[PDB]
Amino acid sequence: MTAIANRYEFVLLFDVENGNPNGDPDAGNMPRIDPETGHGLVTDVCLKRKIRNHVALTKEGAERFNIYIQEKAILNETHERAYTACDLKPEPKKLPKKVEDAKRVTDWMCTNFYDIRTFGAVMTTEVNCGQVRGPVQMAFARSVEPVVPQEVSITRMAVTTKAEAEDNRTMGRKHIVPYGLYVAHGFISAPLAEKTGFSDEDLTLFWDALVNMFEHDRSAARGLMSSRKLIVFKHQNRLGNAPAHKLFDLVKVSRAEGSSGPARSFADYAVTVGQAPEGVEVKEML
Amino acid sequence: MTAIANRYEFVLLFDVENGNPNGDPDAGNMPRIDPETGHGLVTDVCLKRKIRNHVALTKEGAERFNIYIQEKAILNETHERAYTDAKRVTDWMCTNFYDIRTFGAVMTTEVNCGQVRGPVQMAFARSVEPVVPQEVSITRMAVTTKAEAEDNRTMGRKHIVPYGLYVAHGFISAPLAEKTGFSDEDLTLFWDALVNMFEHDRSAARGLMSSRKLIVFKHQNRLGNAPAHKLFDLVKVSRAEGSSGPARSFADYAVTVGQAPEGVEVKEML
Amino acid sequence: TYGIRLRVWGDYACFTRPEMKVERVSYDVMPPSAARGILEAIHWKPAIRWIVDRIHVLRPIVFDNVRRNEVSSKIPKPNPATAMRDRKPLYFLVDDGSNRQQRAATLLRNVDYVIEAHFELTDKAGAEDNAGKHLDIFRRRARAGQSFQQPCLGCREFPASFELLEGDVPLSCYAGEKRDLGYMLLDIDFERDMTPLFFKAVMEDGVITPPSRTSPEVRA
Amino acid sequence: LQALHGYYQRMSADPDAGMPPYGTSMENISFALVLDAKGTLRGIEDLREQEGKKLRPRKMLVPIAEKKGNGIKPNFLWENTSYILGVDAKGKQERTDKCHAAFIAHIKAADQDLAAVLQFLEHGSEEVIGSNIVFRIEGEPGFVHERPAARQAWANCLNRREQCGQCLITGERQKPIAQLHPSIKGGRDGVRGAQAVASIVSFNNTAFESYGKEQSINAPVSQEAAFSYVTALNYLLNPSNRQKVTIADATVVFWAERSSPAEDIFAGMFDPPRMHDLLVAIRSGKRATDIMPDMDESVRFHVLGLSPNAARLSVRFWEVDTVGHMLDKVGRHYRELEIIPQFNNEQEFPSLSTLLRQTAVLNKTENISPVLAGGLFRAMLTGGPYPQSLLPAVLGRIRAEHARPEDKSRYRLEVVTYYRAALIKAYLIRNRKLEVPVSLDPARTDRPYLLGRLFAVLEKAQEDAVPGANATIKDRYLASASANPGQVFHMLLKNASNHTAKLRKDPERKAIHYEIMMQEIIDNISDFPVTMSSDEQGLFMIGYYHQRKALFTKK
Amino acid sequence: MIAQQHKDTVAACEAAEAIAIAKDQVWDGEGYTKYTFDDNSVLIQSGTTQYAMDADDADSIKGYADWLDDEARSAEASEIERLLESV
């Protein structure tokens, strides 16, 4: 599996309409916000989870495309599978002494699992299996404008257990964002892909997952979520030709002059992409 | 072995957005913050590690740019030695080990009091204004062990700095370089590394980190020409006129550099 | 008439006690050896000896704890000849197992000192070398801020900002105190096989007056 | 440290304290000769005890015995009659004479005790013969080998039995340097967290060696000093003695330069359970002598804090102030922490561990950041500013915490508890010099304080309109309201309008009181700030806490 | 554990003291010297004979008691009880 040979930076713009893009376990289930400014947040972990889900759905557990962080899997069992495939006796807390055996087990895990191959993983559990860094990384997604989450109160006409509460129906509540445009930055590293095996077919599948990330993630709390723009910057050499922060600044998002009042649809925003440096190109076709 | 003939003092400005620039091992991995001022802190060894990693990734075992003190991101495919009694061995090390030639080392021969000190030196980097790291709660689908499987989820946490602009000071001593071979091409590579330290350090914890400004004071003499602390004062960084509340982007900060004394130059690599 | 008065200060400082070196614990005040090193960082030649007369403490003793990931062992001497009898990748893995040693340091903060020291000609002094010439060289360098290497408060990651005190030494914070700091390192005697020698340090009026480290009655 | 060495030297002088003198072992002793200062025998004491089964020689702590063999090797100051008495039960007078000559030679390795015992050797019931015997001087308790002069003589003998450099603890020269130190207890009776055996000084790795020195020679201390300080630390670390306490991951041990009653109270001064009266007095600014007179406040007090890691433990903080000064500083600390308790069951003087625990991730002892603990039990007993990290820690806990009815505690846990409010008040009083009342101040007219009070009244309206609610605004909007009042108070006010409207139709039609309170608070505000600083957020939290407490059972 | 490499040879003492962390001693009937290391491992010597002990396993501590002389066991009852609760 020949690895990629170019550094990539990408910017993803996705929406949410009367939905809850990512709940906050500490503040009930309210959408994550930056309390000092009000801007919404979506952990990179959530986006990685959605990408994993899309990969699993579109590959149906085909060979070399299993996903490591599954719904109910036990990680120690997967590491034991790797050790059995490598024909080794696993010490509890330690990697195999022979460094080549440790490399073999880690390479097996990287090869037969897609998300380990892409995002990396930590496997130093009671059956150690090494560590991987992961060529593809992405930071938090932050709304262009402050969001205004609102509490939706709902009821149910049934009661789980034996209770005489209902003289009024059982209560409950949702949390929704009336609308929010989020910007997600991400990086792809050729040097790490060389060590991990992240190939070009993997890159194509990753782009497809980003484009169709939300189309199969519908639920009772998500509302209508969609990916609007996907700008990809491709460098011509393993090490980039321009700092990333310069490239991300080329994607300017601002409210359209013809719009006023709170934003409620993507038409309220205008996105402009500037000219990239000579050593880079922009794939603004996604 | 030509070596740089000028003393340099450089001030590097870098920032982090929704990340953990340097977790504190003595505080459960929370980002380091100065107890006396509340400013965020980033120890120098972290930046030195980043420089070593960048040079290792860039040169990839060039003739004179091997790196000794590596982490387990080492690559074992190719190495070639320049090949140019304690003095002779130390000279070899300096000739074909970039970090040793630049930062120094200790080679088990304390019989030789003269160590390998290396010209470059840099201190802790501290935020320009107090930072307030945020605690982010996360979950995981899978449980690691069958014992905890008997509900099959885990609630981790992840600390981030919403934003912070850090100032790093550094000193390069030409006389020390003359004893190690630190040459001008090494200085250019060092500036390049400082400019592009973080472009290859991306990870799940660090978020987005980048170098914003790099001011270099080039002294005319082999020794200095003005106090270093008076030079660092010329780099004044404050908040822009239209910015209020907590800072969240580099645009909130306005940075200006004063007029240096007559005996020193000033450069802006960024 | 003679002597020098150098002022040094910084935000951080760590003069590790020899008995707590592994888990760094700093002295309350800079020991005379640290002053020796700071002075030699500005100007020194094989034809001289730096002697520290007094150290003035001008700021309160304030501590702080910093922990860092550090390395376990020094890099070993290789034989260059065998370095390419085969392609031998020489490296040290900081993150590998026991190589990673975490060392907690409790260090000072916002220090400020004034160092009084003078000169002495050694056996290998040149026929023309004179204490006045080196004294004037040091004074010129200190006034202009020039230095052989950037001075640091013990550890290189703690740079020192230095000035020459032409006027009177400023008043100290402990002007009315007589604090006993117990025995602390005076210097290291490199002639008698790197043998450390200590002195009972008493901070009278905020100024420490160590005995001369070249005297025979302080050396064994 | 030299303080620990001094502690052992002071306690070791007390025979009953339990300090083992250096170079001594437990050995069988049978008889004790009692003789005057002139060496004349005055009596014999049968110190041997009775088990009922047999009369055994007593076990006594004496200089370690020699490696006896075929040849005669004299023991220092305790031997059989063949050495001391000049006679033996075996009748071998030549062996007895050689033993006596060696013994008299051994002692000579001007004190009245040594001279008196020598004079006895110049002279040379009958059951003493053949048994192990020791000396005792009339008019003084203990035995000859327990006297300071005997200790010095035995130490000098051991030193000559060298296998030395200048000790950095005592400062003496020509002393033998310890190649390795004695280990320190770890675990239940040691520094909690460290492995079973730990050490202050350790150089097992080459990176810690300097100047070509090897092993513990890098820290040259005399063998006696090493043993003394290690034994002192181990004795302190035993919980049987009341001079130990554990905070976060660090275990703190304290002692005084001389015997004092302070050593028995300080275990509770920074760990509250007469002691209550003392705490009340020192908080008010009085002197501890008033509550009880035995304190000599000039005696200086030592506090040491050790933090562990895998196998070696590190010093975290160390204070040497006088008893009076540090008692005054602790009183000032408690004065600053003063707040009206939320519930009658809460401590009047919050424990330092409890305060730190309330900043922990899930309010459990682990997850406490060691740095914050070091900055407490530090800023507490030094009077310096609290670490700047403190306020963001408690604010973040308030952001992350929420009502926890699953705790099985009957009261729905408050997000801004009594302890967090006390911590915020202390930080504001010390680090920011602001004025903060101990209870509600209706005349404060300070914008952050007013906003906090407004939040409290809105919360009360909510929980009155919707009894038994799963979660209130305290769970979610406290963080954003404190940090960004402009962007969130409109929705809170509209929701409170809804709550009062419902509260007006239903019973409790006079909602009117809450509306009046909102009017009276909003009156003093001209604009909702877009953002607030960290100290302003702390003031907001304090105001919310004060208003909430003054509203529990108003009606 | 280096006791297996050097067995009862005296050079085991040299190696241990070269690599060992703080050393302890016992004077109770029969002379005993303790060399402690990281990893909660301790090497104990008396004359040529020696015994290796692990501070996390009960059986090792019991064997350390058994390998000692009777009178020493009484004095070490306190220390033995300390290690034994390691669980």
From Swiss-Prot, chain E:
Organism: Pseudomonas phage D3112 (Bacteriophage D3112)
Gene Ontology BP annotations: symbiont-mediated suppression of host adaptive immune response; symbiont-mediated suppression of host CRISPR-cas system
Keywords per UniProt: CRISPR-cas system evasion by virus, Host-virus interaction, Inhibition of host adaptive immune response by virus, Viral immunoevasion
Gene name for this UniProt entry: orf30
Top-level taxon of origin: Viruses
Protein name: Anti-CRISPR protein 30
Function recorded in the entry: Allows the phage to evade the CRISPR/Cas system type I-F.
